[PDB]
Design a protein around this nucleic acid. Structure first.
Lengths: 121, 132
RNA sequence: AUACUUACCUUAAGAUAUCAGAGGAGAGUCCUACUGAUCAAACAUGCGCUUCCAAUAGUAGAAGGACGUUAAGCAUUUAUCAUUGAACUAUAAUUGUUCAUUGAAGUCAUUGAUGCAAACUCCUUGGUCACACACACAUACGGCGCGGAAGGCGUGUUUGCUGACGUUUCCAUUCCCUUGUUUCAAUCAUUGGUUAAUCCCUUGAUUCCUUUGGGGAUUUUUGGGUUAAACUGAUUUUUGGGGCCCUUUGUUUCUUCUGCCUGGAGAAGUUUGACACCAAAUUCAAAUUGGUGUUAGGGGAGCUGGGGCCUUUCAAAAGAGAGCUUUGUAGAGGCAUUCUUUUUGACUACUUUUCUCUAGCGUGCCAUUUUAGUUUUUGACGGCAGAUUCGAAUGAACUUAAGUUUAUGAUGAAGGUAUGGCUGUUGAGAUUAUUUGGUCGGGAUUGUAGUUUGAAGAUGUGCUCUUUUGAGCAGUCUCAACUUUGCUCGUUCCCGUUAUGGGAAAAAUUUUGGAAGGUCUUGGUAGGAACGGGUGGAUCUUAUAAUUUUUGAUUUAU
RNA sequence: UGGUAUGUUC
């Protein structure tokens, strides 16, 4: 889908990407990751869960496929019953804009620590 | 048998993607337009599309970034093209195109007509005179 | 907010990339602002790299959807079991048919569910960008504009996970304009250049005076100095016109106040601060406490990091001088000699037979000389025909004029000019004769003669080993380094001399690394370096291969 | 050698 996912990136670098994560059933969840852990428990913002019916599976066996989509919103999915994750869609704001946003967050956090040091005195 | 197409979209950075786009916008539900990741056949001096549309030709030169050319099987397919549309703006990505008969036909047109190679040698000599 | 009581708890460890070598500490372990290599992270930086970035010369369209409509669209499929009564098909827990009493749960949904298919409408995204509405291409497309988004590859610097607190008897320490943009015209001021007047220093030239030399004036010739009458590039104050935008929806969104569509503004402040808002008990308002979010964008001077080009200087490598005849030294390597006998293996010559280009001269084959022929060249040159043209300079004709044709047509340029050809000249490629030359026997079989090795004798100078024809060293041969003598070729310069030698640079020039300057482009501009942690977050190992993910009961098969 | 939460008085 001409996204060109990064060639040397991991889960700390794939954050806030619109993932298309596959499970053991095939119940594909599409949404933005915002956190993970050692067991790969993924929170998913604006997530949608898509499946294929049993009648559509005969047409899928060797065209249009009518998938069943349900809307989950902000969910938190476990890492046991998942199989694979890919990157489907890029986020809204770019890498330089995320860098400027992270510098603003660091400056705001340093200002908050200076405010806590001023309130402690 | 070359046709000059003018007021075409400017910048798709790949040439074969613009070829797929143009063969999609000439006729819907084409064999090569509905299926991506298909190797485009090259025709040297094979029918590629229906209604006689043989191939296209674009370039990245700064003087004619928008407009391009197309070539067919023969003059009868071009006459059928201009008799099927008959002064009607065919739709592409956002704009209305305009077609015409070019003052100089394609080199593939010379390959079709002469085989029913000196002009390539003349063009090489003209390029040698221009690059000097 | 202080003071006190009560309820719960008081901590799994070890470490921060890997390999090789050297040194230190009393086989094993630790350290090195120790050295080389790999890898990781950060910041810059470049690869004619890879993909994408939506009409406005219109009322569209690309990607993703509608958890939107037509749509109760069209075609199909299901909507509980058991006992008994009046008939009953009947292997069942009377299954099947019509009616009912009773018994346990009892998805809603049948406008339901699945499949199929078209049209309409609406949402989120973009460079809705700078020039032009243009004749390119077999080496398939001049990817040689300003950027942005995603990614690959390559180079340089720093560090070996990163961030807060404290200390340093550590370094640090800038500003200016702007809060719709752009263009054109008018006016003031400033800077840089050109022309002349009051002019001035030097000089090519003109004129006059005077003592070889100099002085007066002009050309302000050449360069510079004073002043600013005229012209040109740039900045700035004000006014006016034209184009676009105002969704900036709280009318610029950095904040506050005033204020706005006959306009787009004015004033103040900016990171130990300020502004706006939410929540509350104190019984209006007001005040107090806990949090949230903002403090922006563009341009310019200075400093600094990095990328590319050019110039100056130093160090290193080739060029530099090389090739050869002679001497001495000594390095490496190889073997020392000769005859006879035997004929162990090889080679040559001759005999017999067989086969082969023809068994032999010639013929034929091989080299190639362009001497000649034939043939070929996106070969080259010149010219002819489509008009050979163009520097449309000039003359003439057709013609208002333009345009066309033709000449002055080699004075200069375009291979010819063709999108059909052709002429003549020249070289090169192939063949044959020839300037000429070489070649005409080879393979298989049989025996002999000659040379050398396997072996025996005599030998050849001496040392080590040894049964010995024996192997190593002095011996001898060949080659490389120093060294000298003359010849030849030769980079540059000089000299004997332009034959050729002598001397010097042992050079001019190419590359790499380092030092400096100029120009093009980009980023940053207020925090940074060291140490300390009963510091916080990340990464690895073991608990942890056993019910909680991660060391398996999800390919539905007996 | 401590932390979290809660209730009274100033």
């Amino acid at each position: 889908s001409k996204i060109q996912v990064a060639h040397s990136s991991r889960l700390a670098n794939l954050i806030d990407y619109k993932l298309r994560v596959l499970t053991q059933d095939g119940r594909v969840y599409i949404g933005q990751l915002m956190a993970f852990d050692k067991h790969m428990n993924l929170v998913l913002n604006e997530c949608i869960e898509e499946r294929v019916p049993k009648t559509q599976l005969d047409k899928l066996r060797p065209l249009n496929i009518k998938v069943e989509k349900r809307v989950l919103g902000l969910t938190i999915l476990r890492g046991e019953q998942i199989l694979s994750t890919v990157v489907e869609d890029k986020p809204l704001l770019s890498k330089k804009e995320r860098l400027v946003r992270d510098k603003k967050e660091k400056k705001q956090a340093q200002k908050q620590t200076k405010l806590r040091k001023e309130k402690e005195k | 048998s070359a046709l000059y197409f003018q007021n075409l979209p400017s910048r798709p950075a790949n040439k074969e993607n613009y070829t797929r786009l143009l063969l999609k916008h000439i006729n819907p539900n084409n064999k090569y337009a509905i299926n991506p990741s298909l190797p485009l056949p090259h025709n040297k001096l094979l029918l590629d599309d229906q209604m006689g549309l043989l191939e296209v030709s674009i370039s990245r030169s700064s003087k004619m970034t928008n407009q391009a050319f197309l070539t067919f099987v023969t003059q009868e397919e071009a006459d059928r093209f201009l008799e099927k549309y008959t002064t009607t703006a065919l739709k592409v990505q956002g704009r209305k195109v305009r077609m015409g008969k070019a003052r100089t036909n394609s080199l593939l047109g010379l390959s079709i007509e002469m085989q029913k190679y000196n002009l390539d040698i003349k063009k090489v000599l003209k390029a040698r005179k221009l690059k000097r």
